[PDB]
Structure 1
Amino acid sequence: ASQGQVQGLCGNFNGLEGDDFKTASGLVEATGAGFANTWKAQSSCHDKLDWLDDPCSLNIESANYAEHWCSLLKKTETPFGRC
């Protein structure tokens, strides 16, 4: 019963997921950081930018560990296979 009466980082909740980045001052943004910066609760904070990298390429020693376990989600015999 509150469809379209909420604003924040969680969107407007109206059924369309294209206007979710619609700033509080009209137009829609393109990136995920541009929209978020407009909802700061402290004027003194700085602005951030997106990060176009994959952490699994900077920490090589961790890639094998991350894969060996996170791959369990696709194993049908594993308990998560039920879901």
Structure 2
Amino acid sequence: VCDATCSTIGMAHYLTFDGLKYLFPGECQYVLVQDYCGSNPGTFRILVGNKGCSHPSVKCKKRVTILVEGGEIELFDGEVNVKRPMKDETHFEVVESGRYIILLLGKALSVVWDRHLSISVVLKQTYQEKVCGLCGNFDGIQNNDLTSSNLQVEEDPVDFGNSWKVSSQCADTRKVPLDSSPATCHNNIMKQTMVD
């Protein structure tokens, strides 16, 4: 079995490990992925936090806070920032090669960041169903990547991510009326074909 790969294509979409594009415009802070899931120690707790990103625009600067080995290293606005160095500095590593910030954290973990929005965490063979969050469980089964925090499969992913937010008193996002044209392209058929 090969190394899976999340992604955050554009402002509001998510690609799971097993491979499942789905839509989730949120504005609160959300659990991209973690290990503390049911009956396990809880080693790493990668998070993601967006601001003004329910409608994609030149706005929506992300904030990423990753919690491993009792550490707190986070990044936004181009650079990375350490708030609490972790104990085992040996596995730590940062490679600012090209557009990206490649970022190792251990034998079986890695992260990538295009300095603008993309978040592509990369895992190894080690876990094989030890995680949960937005990216799902990493089991090979692709339809069980909507297993909400309350341990059931949903069908409408807008209700999925609302379970995984951190601040349980901030805003749950609104079920949008589905349509093939977003806000501007809605009733502007001309512009739709120049983008198409």
Q: TM-score, normalised by structure 1?
A: 0.65
> Hey, which of these two has a bigger chunk of helix by percent?
1
Shift of 1:67: 2.4
1:36 aligns with 161
1:57 aligns with 186
User: Between the two proteins, what is the percent identity of the paired residues?
Assistant: 33
TM-align CA RMSD: 1.8
Tell me the amino acid that sits aligned with residue 160 of structure 2. Answer: F
Q: Equivalents in 1 of 2:171, 2:154: separation in Å?
A: 18
Residues 63-82 of structure 1 correspond to what in structure 2 (within 5 A)? 63-70=189-196
Tell me the amino acid that sits aligned with residue 57 of structure 1. Answer: H
Structure number with the bigger relative contact order (C-alpha 8 A, sep ≥ 6) is 2
The answer for unaligned runs of 5 or more in structure 2 is 1-124
Shift of 1:64: 3.0
The answer for unaligned runs of 5 or more in structure 1 is 71-83
- The number of aligned residues is 67
> Hey, which of these two has a bigger chunk of strand by percent?
2
Rg larger for: 1
- Structure 1 residues 36 and 69, CA, compared in 2 at 3 Å: closer, same or farther? closer
- Structure 1 residues 69 and 30, CA, compared in 2 at 3 Å: closer, same or farther? closer
Moved over 4 A (4+): none
Q: TM-score, normalised by structure 2?
A: 0.31
